[PDB]
Amino acid sequence: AELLLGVNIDHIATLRNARGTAYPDPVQAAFIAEQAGADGITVHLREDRRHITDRDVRILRQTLDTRMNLEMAVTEEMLAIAVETKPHFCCLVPEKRQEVTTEGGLDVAGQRDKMRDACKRLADAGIQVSLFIDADEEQIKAAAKVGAPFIEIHTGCYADAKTDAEQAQELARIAKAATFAASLGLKVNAGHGLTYRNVKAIAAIPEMHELNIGHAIIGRAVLTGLKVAVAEMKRLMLEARG
């Protein structure tokens, strides 16, 4: 079915806000990204608004040719915004303070009801919720229980791994969780932390539906231009899988 690439243009709006001008404009950056291999555009709407802003969302929604993935914290402000914005996808992540795990995924197991409500509100809005969790059976059982169609497996630990032993351990943990998660009817995304040397093994995990990558692509864009960085990432995934 082929895995999709979702580019995360958060850190493009970081450059923009460092002098608070207009450029580089995340609206322009998504256009480039979409024409270079991306199958969707992810943006995180923090309440800090330090980087991506409501204008970015309001306009990105009107100009994407793909599909938006709205990263948000499950908060009444954001749940509200999610609903008028009607993004196709909507990924729930912890925020600053008590809603997170030591590894750093949304604590679903420990907020079971908060999430059940959130997932229902949003499904009722037409948006497919993804739950951003670590690869723990506990959190995955919780994810499935709460009714979210999707999970996004936090590959932070995999990228940060120092020795090859540790890298291989964390790889297998992800693959086993991706199988188990699918066994409970969940679809599986991954990607936070993925670099151009990480990406291939994760893309070969066949349960994987879509890899959402940001910081590594934007980092390379500054060197090579954003078009070549999206295309390099996408072509690496097609290689890893056919």
The one catalytic residue in 44, 152, 170, 209 is 44
Domain that holds residue 53: 1-242
| CATH number where 189 lies | 3.20.20.70
What's the start-to-end Cα distance of the chain, in Å? 11
Output DSSP code: residue 103. S
* Residues tagged in the binding site annotation for 1-deoxy-D-xylulose 5-phosphate: 10-11, 46, 51, 101
Instruction: Give the three-class secondary structure for 43.
Output: strand
Q: Where are the beta strands (DSSP E) in 23-160?
A: 40-44, 68-72, 89-92, 128-133, 150-153
192 carries an active-site annotation:
yes
Could you tell me the CA-to-CA distances from 232 to 195, 202, 215 in Å, in that order?
A: 11, 16, 14
Q: For the chain, what is the domain count?
A: 1
Q: 68-72 and 4-8 as β-strands: parallel, antiparallel, unpaired?
A: unpaired
Q: List residues forming the annotated binding site for 3-amino-2-oxopropyl phosphate.
A: 8, 19, 193, 214-215
Tokens coding 134: 């670590």
Q: What share of the chain is helix, strand, coil (3-state, %, to 5)?
A: 50, 15, 35
User: Partners of 71 in the beta sheet?
Assistant: 44, 91
Sign of CA dihedral 196, 200, 201, 206: positive
CA-closest candidate to residue 174, choices 230, 220, 135: 135
Q: Which of 34, 71, 170, 210 is catalytic?
A: 71
How far is 51 from 194, CA to CA, in rounded Å? 21
User: What resolution (Å)?
Assistant: 3.1
Known binding-site residue numbers = 8, 10-11, 19, 46, 51, 101, 193, 214-215
Spatial contact of 143 and 107, defined as CB atoms under 8 Å apart = no
Cβ atoms of 149 and 187 closer than 8 Å: yes
The structure tokens listed for 60 are 């990105």
Q: Give the total residue count for the chain.
A: 242
Kindly list the distances between the CA atom of residue 195 and the CA atoms of 62, 72, 216, 226, in Å, as whole numbers in the listed order.
30, 23, 5, 15
User: Experimental method used, please?
Assistant: X-ray
Distance in angstroms (rounded) separating the CA atoms of residues 128 and 145: 15
Quote the CA–CA distance of 93 and 131 in Å, as a whole number.
7
192, 207, 209, 210: the catalytic one is: 192
Spatial neighbors of 79 by CB under 8 A, at least 6 apart, are 72, 118, 121, 122
Query: Is 154 a catalytic site residue?
Result: no
